[PDB]
């Protein structure tokens, strides 16, 4: 029993790897027409020595989006999904 | 003014799959239902990037949840290169 | 306290190949290119099954002895290839 | 085709491909080597990204601080080395 599934044009949706960061160390917010993602952790030991990291990303949202409709989920594997 | 984003669960109750396919054009990606499984195949031949050439390929299968109709399966591609595959609970 | 000078170094690449085991990776020198080939058969993971394969080519610097190129796989699954 | 095979010395490799050479700083401080890198927001595939990290490594007991050198490959790998 074989069917092809057509791939449609979908809404705003991004995947970000953030496995190095705890939930409290990651902030996702809507500012204006951008979704911002800020992530930061202070010095921490890994296998090599000590490491501290920080990034800031911005994604432009599409026109017809209510900010209260933007959602986010963090998989156990540390992948952040953001949709709108 | 800055609005903190609502943090839903990773599980929406029904069949749901998200995959990053930013390296592939739509024609290089194939989604099908075969028996009780959803298959996803993606491949691109060698292309230039940062310091030489790269070619990539993967294949994934997921068992549809019990009682789900294959015809109800759908997929979409976000502008940001995220492939979503879903089926209505049924 | 002392500033260490960063000099122009020799050919060196790092390649995350953590999804593959040492047996599932081959490195070879073909003329003036170093090639990486990696492949794994379908195996289970979090949500279903996955198989993966990639092929990469890096251009070597002029006049390098193909015997002198070296590679190493760290415990973390990062592949280092160098041609000093 | 030629198939390449896969102590108290200091040797590290870091992927710093995202940073200009003047955004990367390597210092010897006491018995530690420190690396700092930072770049401002720049466009990415679908938005903007800024990144920063700080790493500290412990020099092995039989290694002299003043001996530490560093190099950047054409492919964006920073190597930091020292001999006993």
mmCIF file of N, CA and C in Angstrom, chain C:
data_model
loop_
_atom_site.group_PDB
_atom_site.id
_atom_site.type_symbol
_atom_site.label_atom_id
_atom_site.label_comp_id
_atom_site.label_asym_id
_atom_site.label_seq_id
_atom_site.Cartn_x
_atom_site.Cartn_y
_atom_site.Cartn_z
ATOM 1 N N UNK C 1 50.581 36.691 32.812
ATOM 2 C CA UNK C 1 49.805 37.287 31.725
ATOM 3 C C UNK C 1 50.666 37.565 30.487
ATOM 4 N N UNK C 2 50.222 37.073 29.328
ATOM 5 C CA UNK C 2 50.979 37.201 28.075
ATOM 6 C C UNK C 2 50.149 36.873 26.814
ATOM 7 N N UNK C 3 50.042 37.834 25.892
ATOM 8 C CA UNK C 3 49.374 37.604 24.609
ATOM 9 C C UNK C 3 50.173 36.664 23.689
ATOM 10 N N UNK C 4 49.566 35.529 23.346
ATOM 11 C CA UNK C 4 50.155 34.542 22.444
ATOM 12 C C UNK C 4 49.778 34.914 21.012
ATOM 13 N N UNK C 5 50.773 35.058 20.143
ATOM 14 C CA UNK C 5 50.505 35.390 18.737
ATOM 15 C C UNK C 5 49.910 34.213 17.926
ATOM 16 N N UNK C 6 48.809 34.445 17.207
ATOM 17 C CA UNK C 6 48.255 33.432 16.296
ATOM 18 C C UNK C 6 48.856 33.550 14.894
ATOM 19 N N UNK C 7 49.537 32.496 14.458
ATOM 20 C CA UNK C 7 50.213 32.483 13.160
ATOM 21 C C UNK C 7 49.406 31.761 12.064
ATOM 22 N N UNK C 8 49.665 32.094 10.788
ATOM 23 C CA UNK C 8 49.058 31.269 9.731
ATOM 24 C C UNK C 8 49.576 29.826 9.787
ATOM 25 N N UNK C 9 48.657 28.894 10.018
ATOM 26 C CA UNK C 9 48.990 27.496 10.130
ATOM 27 C C UNK C 9 48.726 26.682 8.876
ATOM 28 N N UNK C 10 49.050 25.406 8.963
ATOM 29 C CA UNK C 10 48.917 24.467 7.867
ATOM 30 C C UNK C 10 47.462 23.978 7.722
ATOM 31 N N UNK C 11 47.186 23.254 6.640
ATOM 32 C CA UNK C 11 45.893 22.602 6.442
ATOM 33 C C UNK C 11 45.399 21.907 7.730
ATOM 34 N N UNK C 12 44.215 22.282 8.204
ATOM 35 C CA UNK C 12 43.600 21.583 9.337
ATOM 36 C C UNK C 12 42.075 21.721 9.323
ATOM 37 N N UNK C 13 41.351 20.601 9.276
ATOM 38 C CA UNK C 13 39.892 20.665 9.358
ATOM 39 C C UNK C 13 39.328 19.870 10.527
ATOM 40 N N UNK C 14 38.198 20.332 11.053
ATOM 41 C CA UNK C 14 37.448 19.598 12.067
ATOM 42 C C UNK C 14 36.047 19.323 11.556
ATOM 43 N N UNK C 15 35.577 18.114 11.817
ATOM 44 C CA UNK C 15 34.379 17.593 11.209
ATOM 45 C C UNK C 15 33.627 16.783 12.243
ATOM 46 N N UNK C 16 32.442 17.255 12.601
ATOM 47 C CA UNK C 16 31.589 16.538 13.517
ATOM 48 C C UNK C 16 31.032 15.297 12.800
ATOM 49 N N UNK C 17 31.452 14.116 13.242
ATOM 50 C CA UNK C 17 30.936 12.881 12.671
ATOM 51 C C UNK C 17 30.432 11.971 13.793
ATOM 52 N N UNK C 18 29.753 12.563 14.773
ATOM 53 C CA UNK C 18 29.393 11.852 16.009
ATOM 54 C C UNK C 18 28.317 10.774 15.814
ATOM 55 N N UNK C 19 27.570 10.865 14.719
ATOM 56 C CA UNK C 19 26.560 9.866 14.375
ATOM 57 C C UNK C 19 27.132 8.585 13.813
ATOM 58 N N UNK C 20 28.416 8.592 13.479
ATOM 59 C CA UNK C 20 29.042 7.425 12.850
ATOM 60 C C UNK C 20 30.129 6.836 13.749
ATOM 61 N N UNK C 21 30.379 5.540 13.619
ATOM 62 C CA UNK C 21 31.425 4.892 14.396
ATOM 63 C C UNK C 21 32.691 4.890 13.541
ATOM 64 N N UNK C 22 33.858 4.660 14.159
ATOM 65 C CA UNK C 22 35.123 4.677 13.409
ATOM 66 C C UNK C 22 35.117 3.765 12.176
ATOM 67 N N UNK C 23 34.358 2.672 12.238
ATOM 68 C CA UNK C 23 34.272 1.714 11.128
ATOM 69 C C UNK C 23 33.382 2.238 10.020
ATOM 70 N N UNK C 24 32.539 3.217 10.352
ATOM 71 C CA UNK C 24 31.608 3.781 9.389
ATOM 72 C C UNK C 24 32.146 5.051 8.703
ATOM 73 N N UNK C 25 33.440 5.302 8.884
ATOM 74 C CA UNK C 25 34.126 6.454 8.310
ATOM 75 C C UNK C 25 35.381 5.991 7.572
ATOM 76 N N UNK C 26 35.600 6.517 6.368
ATOM 77 C CA UNK C 26 36.837 6.309 5.614
ATOM 78 C C UNK C 26 37.420 7.658 5.183
ATOM 79 N N UNK C 27 38.717 7.825 5.395
ATOM 80 C CA UNK C 27 39.426 8.994 4.921
ATOM 81 C C UNK C 27 40.448 8.577 3.855
ATOM 82 N N UNK C 28 40.409 9.194 2.681
ATOM 83 C CA UNK C 28 41.485 8.952 1.725
ATOM 84 C C UNK C 28 41.987 10.170 0.985
ATOM 85 N N UNK C 29 43.229 10.082 0.521
ATOM 86 C CA UNK C 29 43.831 11.113 -0.304
ATOM 87 C C UNK C 29 43.790 10.701 -1.768
ATOM 88 N N UNK C 30 43.164 11.525 -2.593
ATOM 89 C CA UNK C 30 43.041 11.211 -4.009
ATOM 90 C C UNK C 30 43.600 12.365 -4.807
ATOM 91 N N UNK C 31 44.821 12.178 -5.299
ATOM 92 C CA UNK C 31 45.562 13.240 -5.950
ATOM 93 C C UNK C 31 45.880 14.352 -4.969
ATOM 94 N N UNK C 32 45.156 15.459 -5.125
ATOM 95 C CA UNK C 32 45.344 16.708 -4.381
ATOM 96 C C UNK C 32 44.151 17.064 -3.459
ATOM 97 N N UNK C 33 43.257 16.104 -3.228
ATOM 98 C CA UNK C 33 42.049 16.300 -2.419
ATOM 99 C C UNK C 33 42.069 15.284 -1.286
ATOM 100 N N UNK C 34 41.625 15.673 -0.102
ATOM 101 C CA UNK C 34 41.394 14.671 0.915
ATOM 102 C C UNK C 34 39.887 14.499 0.993
ATOM 103 N N UNK C 35 39.440 13.245 1.022
ATOM 104 C CA UNK C 35 38.019 12.903 0.951
ATOM 105 C C UNK C 35 37.581 12.247 2.240
ATOM 106 N N UNK C 36 36.374 12.559 2.680
ATOM 107 C CA UNK C 36 35.810 11.847 3.815
ATOM 108 C C UNK C 36 34.535 11.189 3.356
ATOM 109 N N UNK C 37 34.402 9.899 3.649
ATOM 110 C CA UNK C 37 33.195 9.140 3.288
ATOM 111 C C UNK C 37 32.634 8.534 4.544
ATOM 112 N N UNK C 38 31.363 8.756 4.814
ATOM 113 C CA UNK C 38 30.810 8.185 6.020
ATOM 114 C C UNK C 38 29.435 7.650 5.739
ATOM 115 N N UNK C 39 29.089 6.518 6.356
ATOM 116 C CA UNK C 39 27.771 5.927 6.112
ATOM 117 C C UNK C 39 27.294 5.057 7.236
ATOM 118 N N UNK C 40 26.036 5.180 7.631
ATOM 119 C CA UNK C 40 25.533 4.167 8.556
ATOM 120 C C UNK C 40 24.190 3.637 8.127
ATOM 121 N N UNK C 41 24.026 2.326 8.273
ATOM 122 C CA UNK C 41 22.783 1.659 7.924
ATOM 123 C C UNK C 41 21.695 2.095 8.893
ATOM 124 N N UNK C 42 20.448 1.837 8.517
ATOM 125 C CA UNK C 42 19.300 2.170 9.348
ATOM 126 C C UNK C 42 19.427 1.556 10.735
ATOM 127 N N UNK C 43 19.215 2.389 11.743
ATOM 128 C CA UNK C 43 19.317 2.002 13.135
ATOM 129 C C UNK C 43 18.205 2.751 13.850
ATOM 130 N N UNK C 44 17.786 2.253 15.023
ATOM 131 C CA UNK C 44 16.769 3.014 15.748
ATOM 132 C C UNK C 44 17.367 4.244 16.401
ATOM 133 N N UNK C 45 16.562 5.295 16.524
ATOM 134 C CA UNK C 45 16.871 6.372 17.451
ATOM 135 C C UNK C 45 15.612 6.796 18.232
ATOM 136 N N UNK C 46 15.517 8.073 18.597
ATOM 137 C CA UNK C 46 14.475 8.543 19.508
ATOM 138 C C UNK C 46 13.061 8.250 19.031
ATOM 139 N N UNK C 47 12.772 8.586 17.777
ATOM 140 C CA UNK C 47 11.397 8.561 17.283
ATOM 141 C C UNK C 47 11.140 7.452 16.266
ATOM 142 N N UNK C 48 12.151 7.113 15.480
ATOM 143 C CA UNK C 48 11.987 6.060 14.493
ATOM 144 C C UNK C 48 13.306 5.430 14.123
ATOM 145 N N UNK C 49 13.506 5.171 12.833
ATOM 146 C CA UNK C 49 14.798 4.688 12.343
ATOM 147 C C UNK C 49 15.453 5.733 11.448
ATOM 148 N N UNK C 50 16.777 5.734 11.404
ATOM 149 C CA UNK C 50 17.488 6.692 10.579
ATOM 150 C C UNK C 50 18.671 6.000 9.952
ATOM 151 N N UNK C 51 18.930 6.323 8.684
ATOM 152 C CA UNK C 51 20.196 6.021 8.010
ATOM 153 C C UNK C 51 20.761 7.329 7.485
ATOM 154 N N UNK C 52 22.093 7.428 7.430
ATOM 155 C CA UNK C 52 22.753 8.668 7.014
ATOM 156 C C UNK C 52 24.000 8.367 6.193
ATOM 157 N N UNK C 53 24.370 9.302 5.331
ATOM 158 C CA UNK C 53 25.558 9.140 4.526
ATOM 159 C C UNK C 53 25.975 10.510 4.072
ATOM 160 N N UNK C 54 27.271 10.796 4.138
ATOM 161 C CA UNK C 54 27.755 12.040 3.532
ATOM 162 C C UNK C 54 29.120 11.826 2.905
ATOM 163 N N UNK C 55 29.479 12.728 2.007
ATOM 164 C CA UNK C 55 30.749 12.674 1.323
ATOM 165 C C UNK C 55 31.210 14.101 1.248
ATOM 166 N N UNK C 56 32.459 14.320 1.643
ATOM 167 C CA UNK C 56 33.080 15.638 1.615
ATOM 168 C C UNK C 56 34.457 15.546 0.980
ATOM 169 N N UNK C 57 34.871 16.636 0.352
ATOM 170 C CA UNK C 57 36.182 16.754 -0.272
ATOM 171 C C UNK C 57 36.792 18.074 0.143
ATOM 172 N N UNK C 58 38.043 18.036 0.580
ATOM 173 C CA UNK C 58 38.801 19.255 0.853
ATOM 174 C C UNK C 58 40.003 19.288 -0.069
ATOM 175 N N UNK C 59 40.316 20.475 -0.555
ATOM 176 C CA UNK C 59 41.446 20.662 -1.438
ATOM 177 C C UNK C 59 42.716 20.733 -0.590
ATOM 178 N N UNK C 60 43.725 19.928 -0.918
ATOM 179 C CA UNK C 60 45.004 19.974 -0.189
ATOM 180 C C UNK C 60 45.904 21.125 -0.654
ATOM 181 N N UNK C 61 46.849 21.568 0.199
ATOM 182 C CA UNK C 61 47.792 22.604 -0.247
ATOM 183 C C UNK C 61 48.748 22.005 -1.270
ATOM 184 N N UNK C 62 49.334 22.832 -2.151
ATOM 185 C CA UNK C 62 50.203 22.301 -3.215
ATOM 186 C C UNK C 62 51.460 21.594 -2.687
ATOM 187 N N UNK C 63 51.783 20.445 -3.267
ATOM 188 C CA UNK C 63 52.983 19.726 -2.885
ATOM 189 C C UNK C 63 52.944 19.181 -1.476
ATOM 190 N N UNK C 64 51.953 18.350 -1.205
ATOM 191 C CA UNK C 64 51.883 17.652 0.064
ATOM 192 C C UNK C 64 51.988 16.172 -0.247
ATOM 193 N N UNK C 65 52.803 15.460 0.524
ATOM 194 C CA UNK C 65 52.918 14.015 0.369
ATOM 195 C C UNK C 65 51.673 13.363 0.961
ATOM 196 N N UNK C 66 50.849 12.737 0.097
ATOM 197 C CA UNK C 66 49.596 12.053 0.453
ATOM 198 C C UNK C 66 49.766 11.098 1.625
ATOM 199 N N UNK C 67 50.991 10.632 1.820
ATOM 200 C CA UNK C 67 51.324 9.808 2.966
ATOM 201 C C UNK C 67 51.359 10.639 4.250
ATOM 202 N N UNK C 68 51.695 11.923 4.125
ATOM 203 C CA UNK C 68 51.903 12.789 5.290
ATOM 204 C C UNK C 68 50.616 13.394 5.887
ATOM 205 N N UNK C 69 49.497 13.285 5.174
ATOM 206 C CA UNK C 69 48.216 13.715 5.723
ATOM 207 C C UNK C 69 47.843 12.808 6.893
ATOM 208 N N UNK C 70 47.369 13.392 7.998
ATOM 209 C CA UNK C 70 46.987 12.599 9.170
ATOM 210 C C UNK C 70 45.561 12.877 9.614
ATOM 211 N N UNK C 71 44.902 11.870 10.166
ATOM 212 C CA UNK C 71 43.567 12.084 10.688
ATOM 213 C C UNK C 71 43.415 11.432 12.041
ATOM 214 N N UNK C 72 42.499 11.952 12.846
ATOM 215 C CA UNK C 72 42.235 11.366 14.149
ATOM 216 C C UNK C 72 40.802 11.620 14.568
ATOM 217 N N UNK C 73 40.230 10.645 15.251
ATOM 218 C CA UNK C 73 38.872 10.724 15.755
ATOM 219 C C UNK C 73 38.913 10.792 17.282
ATOM 220 N N UNK C 74 38.480 11.917 17.826
ATOM 221 C CA UNK C 74 38.410 12.101 19.268
ATOM 222 C C UNK C 74 37.292 11.242 19.853
ATOM 223 N N UNK C 75 37.370 10.939 21.157
ATOM 224 C CA UNK C 75 36.285 10.227 21.846
ATOM 225 C C UNK C 75 34.917 10.858 21.594
ATOM 226 N N UNK C 76 34.872 12.187 21.515
ATOM 227 C CA UNK C 76 33.636 12.938 21.289
ATOM 228 C C UNK C 76 33.054 12.798 19.880
ATOM 229 N N UNK C 77 33.770 12.096 18.999
ATOM 230 C CA UNK C 77 33.374 11.957 17.607
ATOM 231 C C UNK C 77 33.616 13.186 16.736
ATOM 232 N N UNK C 78 34.734 13.868 16.958
ATOM 233 C CA UNK C 78 35.142 14.945 16.075
ATOM 234 C C UNK C 78 36.352 14.465 15.310
ATOM 235 N N UNK C 79 36.315 14.627 13.992
ATOM 236 C CA UNK C 79 37.382 14.155 13.133
ATOM 237 C C UNK C 79 38.302 15.313 12.750
ATOM 238 N N UNK C 80 39.579 15.109 12.999
ATOM 239 C CA UNK C 80 40.601 16.093 12.715
ATOM 240 C C UNK C 80 41.395 15.552 11.546
ATOM 241 N N UNK C 81 41.570 16.349 10.509
ATOM 242 C CA UNK C 81 42.483 15.981 9.436
ATOM 243 C C UNK C 81 43.475 17.108 9.240
ATOM 244 N N UNK C 82 44.753 16.768 9.195
ATOM 245 C CA UNK C 82 45.815 17.761 9.060
ATOM 246 C C UNK C 82 46.850 17.339 8.022
ATOM 247 N N UNK C 83 47.490 18.323 7.411
ATOM 248 C CA UNK C 83 48.536 18.063 6.443
ATOM 249 C C UNK C 83 49.624 19.084 6.678
ATOM 250 N N UNK C 84 50.380 18.900 7.758
ATOM 251 C CA UNK C 84 51.476 19.805 8.085
ATOM 252 C C UNK C 84 52.592 19.754 7.030
#
